[PDB]
């Protein structure tokens, strides 16, 4: 047990009268009062948990060495993927440690870059007009996610007066007349609501004319009967059709409404009246499948869909004859079609995920015929933003040992052969001393689970190495082995082995992989992660007390469920912003959007599966189980912010209180010696560095792993 300085756990009050009935099952909730973040008693708790946490971290002598290495390894120039508008190319750049990326512009491909906007004096949703004369961007005013959109002129970097409030994730979609754009804002604030405490409902699709106030924007769609339905939108590369996509919750499923802009007399000004919604052709009007438009030749559209294709495919339909849908690129029986991109007037780039590695195909657009195939090494290719009219395609490659390469491919003039456009370099790190491999590991039920393992070349499998394992396992999210500077520090200066596990609930083998780890089958996700740890131990990478596990949000749920079920297997656990009360999550902020993956304790069958793994309801003293008297919980750090509208911090607080009660303060001479603490952020690159240095310092101490120069 790494930690020797004894622990003074603070008193935490239990309300023994709070009890709820779930279909005849009585569940006590003695920390109900921790659900209010503003009360005197909750603020005292925060203060008491901060004092305990600081005292344990002061014993962790490698925090400072970690912090300086992270800073040094992350301090290198980085280029984003370039995109084209008119004859200008745009990209982001960071020298290394700038708090935000700087936005650059150049005249030709061989042109000299100039600074167009430097925020270093938070910013998302950058979108350049068709003629390259304007750009729209979002500023973050608060602690909440709300964004304000402003527009600049690229010629002199001057602002327009236009200010658009109440945007979240919707970028500006510009019409080809350069007069304005479509976007999807939430309504203005009403009586009784407050900027801090407003919900995000009743989303709208609007058109904004440049040089006007938000209150003049044309209303194209809203639905007051279905307040939770949310929106994304798009315009076709030819400029003729506005596409509106309507979604419900977390599912990979959407509606598709199409508006023919060429049929409107006097453009978007026709709707000045409201008459409240525009005359959309409602091509798809249910939530049965995912649809994303890839191209159109007049009224003939190509779409990517999961309709009777859990690995996805490309289909074609004529809007003038919408009963008839025809396969263009058939579903593969082994590989997921992750994305598709129309390029160079008549070509398609398809990005496949094949045993959790990318493969790129280049095809003919009209026929679907295969022209070239490029398998990619262990890592991830992403960010293809080229449009159909563009002849140069760019994308980014990243991996555990590759900080970032941007590749360039002139499909017109010098085709087939990827040239490096920019390559990032980690300073003072010899990449050739390390390697990454993939193995497939059997889960409890026999299913094979792919995991990646990164380690120093030529190590002995003698059980001696500290090991960190990461996973997520939900929502159809594909977990790729990308670059992290702090992970390099763990590998080099702690002698570590890193493992990424592609457990079920992800999307890696399509929709069947997602469904085998959601709702009634969520327990499969935990079993998959436990199996991976058992493999790392039996194959001789590490041992039980030298395994750390880490994850965030749904990944934090992952960590907490796994330590409740198999505490013997782990020496350290770090849960960042986890969903910990699975009976009550849907009651707070936007947690109601996660019922599609988790179920909801409102329905009796869904309760019965939730109660078995809910973290705050399954904390149990491992030493009281008759064969494992020598087991305790791993040293545990729960990470959160004291205020967080994404995953409310009551989740973390209630768990922390439950663990400290059950394992430490309910009994007189507890075998639990490993510390159970929270690292609480009150209220940016340097903030993030300090969080990660704390977590790795605590990890080194807990696993009794010394520093190596």
């Amino acid at each position: 047990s790494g930690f020797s300085k004894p622990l003074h756990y603070p008193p935490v009050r239990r309300d023994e009268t709070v009890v709820d009935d779930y279909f005849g099952v009585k569940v006590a909730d003695p920390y109900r009062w921790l659900e209010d973040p503003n009360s005197e008693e909750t603020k005292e708790f925060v203060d008491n948990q901060e004092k305990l946490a600081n005292s344990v971290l002061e014993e962790c002598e490698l925090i400072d060495k970690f912090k300086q290495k992270i800073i040094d390894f992350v301090n290198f120039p980085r280029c984003g993927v370039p995109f084209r508008r008119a004859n200008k190319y745009f990209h982001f750049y960071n020298s290394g440690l700038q708090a935000q990326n700087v936005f650059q512009m150049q005249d030709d491909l061989d042109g000299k870059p100039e600074v167009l906007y430097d925020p270093n004096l938070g910013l998302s949703l950058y979108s350049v007009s068709e003629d390259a004369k304007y750009f729209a961007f979002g500023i973050h005013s608060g602690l909440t996610e709300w964004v304000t959109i402003k527009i600049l002129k690229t010629e002199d970097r001057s602002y327009l007066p236009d200010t658009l409030e109440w945007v979240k994730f919707s970028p500006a979609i510009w019409t080809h007349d350069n007069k304005g754009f479509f976007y999807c804002p939430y309504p203005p604030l009403k009586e009784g609501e407050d900027h801090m405490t407003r919900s995000a409902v009743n989303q709208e699709a609007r058109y904004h004319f440049l040089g006007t106030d938000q209150s003049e924007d044309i209303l194209l769609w809203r639905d007051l009967e279905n307040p939770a339905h949310h929106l994304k939108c798009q315009i076709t590369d030819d400029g003729k059709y506005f596409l509106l996509y309507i979604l419900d919750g977390c599912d990979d499923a959407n509606k598709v409404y199409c508006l023919d802009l060429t049929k409107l007399p006097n453009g978007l000004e026709s709707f000045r009246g409201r008459e409240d919604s525009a005359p959309f052709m409602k091509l798809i009007d249910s939530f049965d499948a995912s649809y994303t438009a890839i191209a159109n030749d007049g009224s003939v559209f190509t779409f990517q869909t999961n309709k009777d294709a859990p690995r996805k495919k490309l289909v074609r339909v004529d809007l003038n004859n919408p009963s008839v849908w025809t396969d263009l690129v058939p579903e593969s029986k082994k590989d997921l079609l992750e994305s598709a991109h129309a390029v160079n007037e008549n070509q398609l780039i398809l990005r496949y995920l094949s045993d959790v590695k990318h493969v790129l195909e280049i095809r003919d657009l009209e026929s679907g015929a295969l022209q070239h195939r490029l398998p990619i090494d262990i890592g991830s290719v992403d960010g293809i933003t080229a449009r159909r009219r563009d002849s140069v395609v760019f994308f980014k490659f990243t991996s555990i040992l590759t900080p970032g390469i941007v590749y360039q491919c002139d499909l017109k003039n010098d085709p087939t052969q990827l040239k490096i456009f920019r390559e990032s370099v980690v300073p003072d790190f010899d990449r050739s001393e390390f390697e990454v491999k993939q193995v497939f590991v059997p889960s409890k039920d026999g299913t094979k689970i792919p995991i990646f393992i990164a380690a120093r070349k030529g190590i002995s499998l003698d059980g001696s190495h500290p090991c960190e394992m990461h996973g997520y396992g939900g929502f159809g999210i594909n977990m790729m082995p990308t670059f992290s500077a702090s992970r390099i520090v763990f590998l080099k200066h702690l002698g570590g082995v890193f493992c990424l596990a592609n457990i079920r609930g992800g999307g890696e083998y399509g929709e069947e992989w997602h469904k085998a780890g959601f709702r009634d089958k969520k327990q499969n996700v935990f079993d998959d992660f436990i199996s991976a740890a058992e493999y790392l131990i039996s194959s001789g990478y590490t041992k039980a007390r030298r395994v750390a596990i880490e994850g965030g949000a749904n990944g934090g749920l992952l960590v907490a469920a796994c330590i409740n079920q198999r505490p013997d297997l782990f020496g350290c656990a770090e849960a960042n912003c986890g969903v910990m009360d699975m009976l009550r999550f849907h009651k707070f902020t936007l947690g109601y959007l996660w019922t599609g993956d988790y179920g909801c304790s409102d329905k009796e069958e869904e309760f019965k599966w939730l109660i078995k793994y809910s973290p705050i309801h399954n904390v149990r003293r491992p030493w009281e189980q008759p064969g494992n008297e020598e087991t305790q919980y791993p040293a545990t750090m729960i990470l959160t912010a004291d205020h967080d509208d994404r995953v409310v911090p009551l989740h973390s607080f209630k768990l922390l209180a439950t663990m400290q009660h059950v394992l430490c303060t309910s009994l007189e001479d507890s075998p639990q010696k490993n510390p159970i603490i929270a690292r609480i952020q009150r209220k940016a690159t340097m903030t993030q560095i300090a969080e990660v240095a704390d977590r790795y310092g605590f990890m080194a101490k807990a696993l009794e792993a010394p520093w190596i120069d």
Partner: peptide, 7 residues
């Protein structure tokens, strides 16, 4: 495109 720092 506009990526946070890979900490």
């Amino acid at each position: 495109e506009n990526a946070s720092a890979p900490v």
